[PDB]
Design a protein around this nucleic acid. Structure first.
Lengths: 99, 205, 92, 78, 91, 92, 100, 79
DNA sequence: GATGTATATATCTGACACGTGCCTGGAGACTAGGGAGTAATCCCCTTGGCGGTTAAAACGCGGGGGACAGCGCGTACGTGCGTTTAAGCGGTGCTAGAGCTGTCTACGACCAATTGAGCGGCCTCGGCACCGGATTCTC
DNA sequence: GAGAATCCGGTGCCGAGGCCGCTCAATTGGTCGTAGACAGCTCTAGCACCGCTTAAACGCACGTACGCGCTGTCCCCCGCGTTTTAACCGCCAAGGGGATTACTCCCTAGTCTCCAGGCACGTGTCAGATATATACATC
């Protein structure tokens, strides 16, 4: 009768993350406040990378996100390049890099 | 977000009286009721709307939600405007009608703004913001169409901006499953008299 | 019957952008993004339930896992946003 | 043959993507060599999973998991 | 010139630089030599996955190994450069 | 009260060598060796209890984890020795 | 009657089974797995200590010190790929000399 | 007052002789003092976190071993 | 041929292999209930092949572009040697801090009903990919 | 100072987003065992410091072994034009096995109970460390 994400003020789910964190066998006891925090962290990460992707999408006069835009939005930003270092995005290509 | 829709929402809520502003914001269904509980409803109106915009600064906004707020504002102030009555002839789900009308109108001119709202007796309230092929659509002079699925009748709001009246008429006739559109003498202020003068004839043809 | 994370990424994209569409292939990338970060953090915080000889995963262990698994400014923004979510979760 | 499908202009385009201006001639052997010593370490690390769940079919998730264990995490194809 | 246009062109598009069926026949030939006798079915997406990984690996290897030819004053790659670039990492 | 693996490494060393002593520091290295390989294999085989949607760890999953985590000849000798241990464990 | 001596091993079996129960690895642990695991660990331990003892013998010392394990790991080919990301305390390096 | 010059002009020379370098150049003495410093941050910021979590003001050896294992450069000999 | 370069032993020094006491974690026993292994099935995804085209690769050729080898000036680096400074031993104090032993309580597993949020199938229509056309740029 | 690079427009096409049916998994709610926060006490091992002392760094003067720019030579990839060729598209058949369900059964988990093994402690005593002194290897 009342949603968990609506109490959380978020958009990613909470019950699904809690279900995976019980069924994944990560610990034998799961605290209640944990997956709300974890879903908020995941929401902020996806929001950051899509917020960086959409600007490059409008830069190429497009409105439909292709993987090249995600490749550029990962590789141009410094801290996401620190995070997603050993990841080859599929259908991605490389940066324009000469000499 | 852009810094244009905030002035529109602020001006629209400044037009709302304090007698039913909580009714408007509960019926609009866009903010959390805890944030309704946070806002003081006892200070003056020149800061309540500032606090409400500052709520809407953070979470979500669009032009579509502001347009739907404008629709709900217009649905409770029918005494202000003066209406016009149309009818189609020479010839059903409403989703295909919405898609067909949108497309058509967006293929007619470059910049338009269309907004729908579902109301009982199969009613649909259609807000149209006209524009040109070089300018932004003027939100502050809308055009409202009350359309019914069963009856071929449509109630039409007047506006300052004419010259799009036969374009809207032909686009709504092609958007519906019809070929003819008329323009009767019926131009009055209250919707119930037009409702009666249509439905006494239509239900008892 | 085989779930994914497409609808939620679509809702976040329609939140922070008005009408920017996303293709059905790149959305798949987002699935393999966020079935991956959840594998790191909620994996690695499990390790901190083992070094301190505990058996629970509270918010504090996830907070330290976010402090570890992310570089500086992004980690600061994430830890500032997560407790902001938790405090408005507690007073339900 | 079954190794000469990776022709000279294929390796040439693989180099010209990488920013290489001028290419020598012996590269066209060693690259093929290193290509083989890559793919072997992806194949058997895949196919052991295929021999575990007793099926005769290598799914895409098996190759993604082999590259996961190898070090180079692949997105998208999950 | 010519190469200055090709570097600008190939770094823009995101195609597959290796043809499908020779790479598929090579992958099947390698898969036959391990655990012999039986064949092995391949889903049509898995070979595309392994091809994308191999192309990204080889492009990253050449782009990493090219920096040891500007460093020596040269312009041109050599197999010494590629073998040294693999020697540095530890692969 | 804080256990280790010194005694067993000492027994194996006195088995395969007559009198070769081992210092008290290098023995510590052996602890951090074999509290590490056990973290890999019996960690990684747990992952193969998750991809196939199971809940057990039998001998077959540990066998495949040894086939993965070791290079060729050493893995062949290890898989040849382990089943040799298991078969004389079964007929107890 | 002990499970170490029943399978003819030297590494313990009850301790490995205790660490697989309380290690959060799966919900159920079979009986045929930890004997296999202890056998593999015993083989790897013997594989290291044979080379370590031979390198200690060739330096005319009757005691094993971490320089000897460093030499035995970095001279073997298989353990060079198994332990390729490992630093060893009191380690030292190989005697590497090269000219132009 | 120098605070990084405890790394001396010949201690870098001893590390280069262990590495097997015949003839060091000049400004290496100003370069290595950078690099080491950066590496220590990516241990100590990664090792002050674990000891912050267990409510301990003492940075034990196991914390540095865990931080080095998480970085990727596994250390054995201590514990 | 004097300077290393390996070896004999001096002894002295402490780690370490070993012996004992002992606490507690591993073995024996056995029930029980979910995990799964075997059996059948049916479709669905893959494999094999015919055929025709069309980009794409292979091959000669010549020409400039670049790699390589020698070389002279010189300067930045190794080395020898007196000083002076900071690092180690080691010894004292001595107290903050790990840890660990009880407790009691909030808290999270555990479970029966129930319903809507999200997944599967479908259907456009606008976004986009490609093809052809009009406006700039360096040799 | 004109073929090549960039922007623009038109048209097919096809996948992206909206829509409906539905079902099963997430919600709500009440129960109980217990994991861990919290306090206080106790041993210990890390820090501060100081005197000495001495091993190494510091500073410098100098000789000279590479760093580097230059230049001559010779070979060797790249662009170009022609010929050849196999990759791909679309289709069509067919069939091997991947995914699903049933069903029994068996094998691991929990709890109790008993005691043999692995850990902390203590101690003589051999392995080597370093040190001096003396027989070989060498540019």
């Amino acid at each position: 009768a009342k949603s968990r994400s609506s109490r959380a003020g978020l958009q990613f789910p909470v019950g699904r993350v809690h279900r995976l964190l019980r069924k994944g066998n990560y610990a034998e006891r799961v605290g209640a406040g944990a997956p709300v925090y974890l879903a908020a962290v995941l929401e902020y990460l996806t929001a950051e990378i899509l917020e960086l992707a959409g600007n490059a999408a409008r830069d190429n006069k497009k409105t439909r996100i292709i993987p090249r835009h995600l490749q550029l939005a990962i590789r141009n930003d410094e801290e996401l390049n620190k995070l997603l270092g050993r990841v080859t995005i599929a259908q991605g290509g490389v940066l324009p890099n000469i000499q | 977000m852009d810094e244009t829709v905030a002035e529109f929402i602020k001006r629209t809520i400044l037009k709302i009286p304090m007698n039913e502003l909580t009714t408007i914001l509960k019926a609009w269904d866009f903010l959390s009721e805890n944030q309704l509980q946070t806002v003081n409803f006892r200070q003056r109106k020149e800061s309540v709307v500032q606090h409400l915009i500052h709520l809407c600064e953070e979470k979500r906004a669009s032009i579509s939600d502001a347009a739907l707020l404008d629709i709900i504002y217009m649905q409770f102030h029918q005494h202000q405007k003066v209406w016009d009555v149309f009818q189609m002839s020479k010839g059903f789900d409403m989703k295909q009608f919405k898609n067909s009308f949108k497309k058509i109108l967006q293929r007619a001119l470059k910049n338009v703004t269309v907004s729908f709202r579902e109301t009982e007796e199969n009613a649909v309230w259609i807000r149209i913001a006209w524009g040109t092929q070089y300018t932004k659509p003027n939100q502050y002079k809308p055009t409202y169409v009350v359309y019914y699925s069963q009856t071929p009748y449509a109630f039409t709001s007047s506006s300052m901006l004419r010259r799009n009246t036969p374009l809207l008429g032909q686009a709504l006739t092609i958007a519906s499953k019809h070929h003819q559109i008329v323009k009767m003498d019926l131009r009055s202020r209250y919707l119930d008299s037009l409702k009666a003068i249509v439905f006494k004839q239509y239900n008892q043809t | 019957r085989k779930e994914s994370y497409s609808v939620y990424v679509y809702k976040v994209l329609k939140q922070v952008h008005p009408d920017t569409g996303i293709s059905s292939k790149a959305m798949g990338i987002m699935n393999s993004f966020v079935n991956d970060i959840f594998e790191r953090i909620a994996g690695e915080a499990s390790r901190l339930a083992h070094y301190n000889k505990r058996s629970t995963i509270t918010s504090r262990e996830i907070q330290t896992a976010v402090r570890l698994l992310l570089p500086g400014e992004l980690a600061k923004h994430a830890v500032s946003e997560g407790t902001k979510a938790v405090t408005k979760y507690t007073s339900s | 043959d079954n190794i000469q499908g990776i022709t000279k202009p294929a390796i040439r385009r693989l180099a010209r993507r990488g920013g290489v201006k001028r290419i020598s001639g012996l590269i066209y052997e060693e690259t093929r060599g290193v290509l083989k010593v890559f793919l072997e370490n992806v194949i058997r690390d895949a196919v052991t999973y295929t021999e575990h769940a007793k099926r005769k079919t290598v799914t895409a998730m098996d190759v993604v998991y082999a590259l996961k264990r190898q070090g180079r995490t692949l997105y998208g194809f999950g | 010139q010519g190469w200055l246009k090709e570097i600008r062109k190939l770094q823009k598009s995101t195609h597959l630089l290796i043809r499908k069926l020779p790479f598929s026949r090579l992958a099947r030939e390698i898969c036959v030599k391990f655990t012999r006798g039986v064949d092995f079915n391949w889903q049509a997406q898995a070979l595309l996955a392994l091809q994308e990984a191999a192309e990204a690996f080889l492009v990253h290897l050449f782009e990493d190994a090219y920096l040891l030819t500007l460093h020596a004053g040269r312009v041109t790659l050599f197999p010494k450069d590629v073998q040294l670039a693999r020697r540095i990492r530890g692969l």
